[PDB]
Amino acid sequence: PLESQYQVGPLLGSGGFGSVYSGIRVSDNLPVAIKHVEKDRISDWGETRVPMEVVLLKKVSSGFSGVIRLLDWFERPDSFVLILERPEPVQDLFDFITERGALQEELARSFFWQVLEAVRHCHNCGVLHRDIKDENILIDLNRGELKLIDFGSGALLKDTVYTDFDGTRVYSPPEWIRYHRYHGRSAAVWSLGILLYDMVCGDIPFEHDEEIIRGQVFFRQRVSSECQHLIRWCLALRPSDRPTFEEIQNHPWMQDVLLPQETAEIHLH
C-alpha cells in the first residue's frame, strides 16, 4: 500500500521517463521522489518482469554513491511506481547552469569529477546510464554533492556493440548518428565531453547531426587550454581515440579537485 506509507507532494516534472512527484515517507518523514511509469510506455523489461530501470537501480543502489538510490518499488495494474531517494535542498544541473551561465573551471572540475565517480560506480556495477546530461544531474546545494538520476534509457553494460539508443540525441556520438552502432564506455565518454563543454561554456556544443559528425568544437567562452584539450579528447571522432575514465581523471585539468563541502562553501552557499 504505497498510498499509505508515502505522502505525495507536487509534481517535480514529467516526460519520457514518466511522472515524478515530491514526497515524504510517512514512516520517518524521509523526503523521497515518487516516479510513475505506465506499463504501455516501457520497451525494456528486466528480470518477475519489471522495467529495466528497476534492475539497473538495484545493481547500483547498494552502498553510498553519487547516484540516486531506489528505496522501494510497487507494481500497479497499469503502471510501476518507484520510490527514490530525494536530497534537499536541490536544483538540477540544467537549471543551475541556466541561472548562472558558464561555470568557473574550479566549480566545473568539482562537478565533473563527481559525475565521473558516479559513472565509474555504475560501470563498476555492470550498468550503463546512456543519458548522461545536465538534466539528469541533481545538485545537493548544502553538501555540494551531485547525484545521477533517470536510468530509464540505460542497459546492462556489455563489451559488444549496441544497436539501440533512446537517450538524448545532441548528447549521442557520431558513430550512433552515422551507423546506429556504438560501444558503451566510449559513447559515455563522448556524452561526458558534451557535458563538460556545457558546464564551461553555458550551453552544449552541437545542435544538428551535421555538427556532431563534423566534430569541430568552437569555444564561445574563455576556457583554459587544458580544459579545451580534455574536451576535444572526449569528443574525438574515432571512438577508440577517446580517453578511458582513468585517463580523464589523470588529466592535467582534473588535478586538485575541491571536496564537495568546500565546493558548496565557496560556490553554492
Side-chain angles (χ1 to χ4, degrees), residues 156-205:
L156 294 167
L157 179 67
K158 65 181 181 180
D159 300 301
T160 48
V161 70
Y162 286 94
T163 53
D164 74 300
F165 178 72
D166 185 51
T168 304
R169 203 180 176 74
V170 292
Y171 277 81
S172 69
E175 58 270 27
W176 163 253
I177 304 289
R178 307 176 67 197
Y179 315 116
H180 275 205
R181 295 166 63 75
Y182 64 92
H183 282 81
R185 316 180 179 89
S186 67
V189 169
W190 170 279
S191 73
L192 286 170
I194 300 293
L195 174 66
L196 212 204
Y197 177 102
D198 183 44
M199 285 180 189
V200 298
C201 291
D203 209 348
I204 56 187

Side-chain angles (χ1 to χ4, degrees), residues 79-178:
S79 73
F80 281 92
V81 181
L82 281 61
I83 302 297
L84 267 17
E85 172 191 342
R86 174 171 65 86
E88 45 170 38
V90 172
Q91 190 180 211
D92 71 16
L93 220 198
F94 181 84
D95 289 353
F96 183 94
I97 289 170
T98 297
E99 296 184 1
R100 294 211 187 184
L103 311 183
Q104 303 182 194
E105 301 200 9
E106 175 175 88
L107 182 56
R109 177 160 47 241
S110 170
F111 279 9
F112 192 59
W113 180 267
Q114 289 186 59
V115 170
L116 277 160
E117 290 288 327
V119 177
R120 286 179 57 204
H121 170 71
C122 295
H123 287 27
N124 188 194
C125 289
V127 183
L128 189 68
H129 188 286
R130 293 198 297 179
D131 192 26
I132 299 168
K133 57 171 180 183
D134 55 13
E135 287 175 299
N136 293 328
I137 293 170
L138 264 29
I139 300 166
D140 173 340
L141 298 170
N142 288 170
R143 326 213 63 144
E145 308 174 345
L146 305 207
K147 307 281 199 181
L148 241 297
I149 59 176
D150 192 17
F151 283 69
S153 307
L156 294 167
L157 179 67
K158 65 181 181 180
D159 300 301
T160 48
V161 70
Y162 286 94
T163 53
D164 74 300
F165 178 72
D166 185 51
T168 304
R169 203 180 176 74
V170 292
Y171 277 81
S172 69
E175 58 270 27
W176 163 253
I177 304 289
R178 307 176 67 197

Side-chain angles (χ1 to χ4, degrees), residues 248-267:
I248 292 181
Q249 294 193 289
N250 275 155
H251 189 284
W253 188 76
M254 288 286 252
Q255 305 320 293
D256 302 310
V257 62
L258 296 179
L259 294 176
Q261 193 49 72
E262 295 182 297
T263 303
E265 285 161 3
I266 301 176
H267 296 282

Side-chain angles (χ1 to χ4, degrees), residues 2-10 21-34 83-84 86 88:
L2 131 80
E3 359 249 323
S4 161
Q5 41 191 324
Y6 293 100
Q7 176 168 42
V8 193
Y21 299 80
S22 177
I24 46 189
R25 187 203 271 151
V26 189
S27 177
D28 59 316
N29 297 309
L30 178 67
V32 298
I34 309 175
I83 302 297
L84 267 17
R86 174 171 65 86
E88 45 170 38

Side-chain angles (χ1 to χ4, degrees), residues 197-198 200-206 218-223:
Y197 177 102
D198 183 44
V200 298
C201 291
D203 209 348
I204 56 187
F206 315 128
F218 167 89
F219 284 83
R220 51 177 74 93
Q221 300 283 312
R222 198 283 164 176
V223 176

